[PDB]
Amino acid sequence: MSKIFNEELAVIEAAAIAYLTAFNRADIPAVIATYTDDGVLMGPGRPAAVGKDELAEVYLSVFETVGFDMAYEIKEVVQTSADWAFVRSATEGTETNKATGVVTPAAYQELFLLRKSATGSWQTARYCTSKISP
């Protein structure tokens, strides 16, 4: 009957979710901490942010400008080798502009490329998010 989930896939998914929950709390240090030191963010309206200093600067600007209220869904979890994996997610909910106060619907889709650190921890090496709507 039962489907058992590979223990390493469970730990990998938990690493992607650690980001999504930190992001939805707008907790920037928790967000930064999920990335490898050479991590890259590719998001809409901004060129790639490379490394924790550039990452911090982008997320600071995002949470200054906009408030997100989002639910996530995990779409796939795949381990491609001992130290590498990917996760695909989708988030949806609302976006509030902090200047104007205007709340609008928002949906995104995300790809995490995860790498297992030398001490056994899964971290986001590369991350891409695209806006589905509006």
Place this chain on the structure above:
Amino acid sequence: KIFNEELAVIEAAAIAYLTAFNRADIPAVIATYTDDGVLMGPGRPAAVGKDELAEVYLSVFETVGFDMAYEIKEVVQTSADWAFVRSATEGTETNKATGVVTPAAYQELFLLRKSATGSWQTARYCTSKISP
């Protein structure tokens, strides 16, 4: 084999997509993907499988004319059969309805998988619009 450095073969595969895309060559674009390939791009939900990929690229090229130059930012082989490539493109986009030409820049992540026959194919692909 053409070059023994697998990294060059991997980069080659990503460049074949970007050039196919810039030529608006949909069959050539579809053929760079695995059968279960995923495209994640702006304004649309994930397209999963060649049937869904076809539909989206059809619609993109029905709606917009792209005139783009590419740059490869990184090529990384993570294991024997897996790699990633990060690139960026910039140029103009022309809306085919309105005729309005506007500057466009994008950034792209490829996850490529080496097939049973030795070909590098795109398994997962994300593109995000930098501007405007």
